[PDB]
Please model this.
Amino acid sequence: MAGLAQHIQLKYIFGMNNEIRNSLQFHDEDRIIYPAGYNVVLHDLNDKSQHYYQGTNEYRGISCLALSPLKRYLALGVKGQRDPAIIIFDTFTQKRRKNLGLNLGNLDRYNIKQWVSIAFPSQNQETKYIFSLSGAGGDVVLCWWWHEKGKCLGSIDLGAQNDIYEISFNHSDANSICVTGNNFFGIYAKIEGT
Amino acid sequence: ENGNLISNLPADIVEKNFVAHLWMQCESYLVVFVESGEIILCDSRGNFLQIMEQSPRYFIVSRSGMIKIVAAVAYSKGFYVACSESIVLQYHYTQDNDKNPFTCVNQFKLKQFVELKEIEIKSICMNKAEDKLLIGLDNNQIYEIKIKPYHPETVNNDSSEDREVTLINHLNHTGPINSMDICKRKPIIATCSTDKTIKIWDYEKKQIKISWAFNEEAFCLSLHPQGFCVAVGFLDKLRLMNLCIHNSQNTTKNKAYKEISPFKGCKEIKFSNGGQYFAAVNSTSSNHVIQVFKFFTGENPSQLVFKGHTGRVKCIAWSSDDSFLLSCGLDGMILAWKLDQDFQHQQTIVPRIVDIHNKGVNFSGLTLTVDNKTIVAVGNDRHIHQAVINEQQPVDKTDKKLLDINLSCLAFPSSNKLLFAGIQDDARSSGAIRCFIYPLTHGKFTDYQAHDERGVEKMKITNDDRYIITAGKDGCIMVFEIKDKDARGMKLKDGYAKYSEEELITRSDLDDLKSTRDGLIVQINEFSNQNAM
Amino acid sequence: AAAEEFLIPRDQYNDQKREIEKLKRQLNEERMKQEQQIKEKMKDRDDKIN
Amino acid sequence: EENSKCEPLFMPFHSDKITGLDVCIRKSLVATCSVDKTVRIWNYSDNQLENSKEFEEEAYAVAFHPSGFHIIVAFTEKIRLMNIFENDLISFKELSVKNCREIQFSNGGHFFAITNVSMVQVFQFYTGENPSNLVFRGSGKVRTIFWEEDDQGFYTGSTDGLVIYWRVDDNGPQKTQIAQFNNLIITSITGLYNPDTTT
Model:
């Protein structure tokens, strides 16, 4: 099938979106990734050039963004009608790679409507695991073998009535993940595969 | 299970709002931040250790009493914490102070650097070089501050003179754009939003030209074809202003060169393609009369006074020749009033070439094909209503093309080969712009993600069809270049491809600039010749 | 009130802005140089005082 | 010789016949083009010469845009669209129209009509487009153009004593012979509109 020619393609975005906590990050020493509307804009401080990571039309909005410690991957959580997803874009290529939550049949136990935070593991593990702290429908942190399987290897329940919004990996210990939220602070170390 | 895991953590801190957690690589430390302003210290294992005495809540006398940490970014020798009132605390990791391994060694207020009144930090980030700190505030603006490496000798907390705060982007709209317009001779995006700021955006240069601050919010604005005047009529009066790039302190520059009063509830202002007239929807008590005022004279003839709209008018369109004005609104009635005096005199009441009323449909966006043959309107019914403009008989029914999402506004490129529509629907939050291959075929269209869940409010297409500008409720202005060569009208072929490069400058503005130059030269020479004795 | 605004080329307006910007930068540079020279004189004369 | 400087006693005047005269609406400006090759914008409120430009070619006609920011000057060979600057007149475009003796802007400032011998062309000033339906042909040398209040039509009077009302709507080229004045070389045409609701 011949793809329909794009009638119009975005050129520049006038404005910025700050509703995502920790949504402003340094992709490099000159490019900064920030949420703007439904497109994640990497803005260059020199030429003001904006590179727009665009999600699929099947989703509603953007909840949170995380960047791998090596800054090679950008994982964005998408708030959708029923199934939130995690879209990981390759900064080097600037192309969408894969999405988490598409096969959420096994995770239907969690009524996650959005991911409040995204955490990449250490630089030596960033490319093999990625964790998503879910909000507005259950604080669920899911271990995803995103690089190869893209499957949830484990589920961490942080409480049904916890306003949890931030998740990250311990710099000294990638086996440990720290999650912060309203009246919630957890630190989980994966021991013997759990 | 629900059992708590933070051992030794204080009971009061257990019920405290943890805003952020950072990992200091110095000693694998974990720095937690509470909404109360307390910074919790923990080892690499996360067990509670203490709240450093230099935490914001204990050493900062906030105007509100309690300072809230919003975001923190950890660097090699410590971490930077953001607290309300535009406050930033740099907690450096000092080996000598074991009881307080991280101590606030430098504090600065972003308010003292930028004239931002009561703006709080939304996100704080640092680059790899640890030289530039980016702070995204609640005003949709990101400011970069250069923070020098922490030197133990330079313990000066008030060493803010070495920091420069610059806005990475322009003065982007912080709220939904009330109305949109663009001119033909200049690449100007005239946007009126709830923030009481009317902003002109050079999309070709992707910059802000004029930012007018008004004590009264702007509802709808229209740009004259010459690009020199803007009718930005407010709820109390239609204000025609001259777009002067030189926006000096004088509030008179925001004053309209022509104020027409009393004008009430003007929600749709559109200048005719020729610029000779501008139609504004004067929201009368019950009539919602769309009145055309001559741009150069500001007069509204009674015969040009158009009436019949039972409800709010939501969209106005002008024919290629401007021979007729098309109006749609929440009333669900599309009225095409012919400005021709001969046509108007034929009937006692305001004659309407196309008078259609689809009950149950609230028209939101109206567009006309460049040939002035098809009027395409989109409302809440999820139907594109196409009306064939026939002068012989007034249009009574519209061809309704079904859609899966409501459209808030419509536009036609000069070629008419495509029909662009803004997306404003609450069904699916995907904010995008949808282009049909006009004429609208059997469900053949292409979507492009443009705005957020708030949808597309206003849309316009450049005369050359090179670009489409869409303004949504998110405060972002969207520019999409049309790749459809067939859909791009080759109107710029005959020399006029270049937008007018002249700007309106008052004699007063020029004299002020010259006086400023003279004063600057006088001051410079006085300083040069001033004795140091 | 007849429109007193007269068309000016954007190039001319930007040149007028740039001249004032250069004058302001020169004034700032001269102020900084005067302050630094006075500070150096203060350093030397405080050395003499000491 | 420098001390023996020569300047107009009060201000420079036209050294030849003024070929065309027009007045603005939004400003106090009058554009006058003279056979002396000088096109001058005159501020009558100040009785001063706001602008004065000397062109290599004689300016046959001058039409002043209603905005007060633009002028259109027909010379011996071409019609130059000059932006009214503080002290100079720079033409952003030029139309290859010869012997154009009657140039007039509309009330709405969108259409300007120019006469060449026997054809009158109406141009979209902002877009500079001469639609094929806006080129109108008559008999003899058209001497005057008078646009209507609604700006939808204009009466052109030629040297043969013929006045033709020409429409500018999208319904194509519509022409009506208002009158035929035999033995009269029409040099001026004006008019008015009656909004009377009479039967």
Observations:
- Helices of chain C lie at 10-49.
- Chain C touches chain D through seven residues (CB under 8 Å).
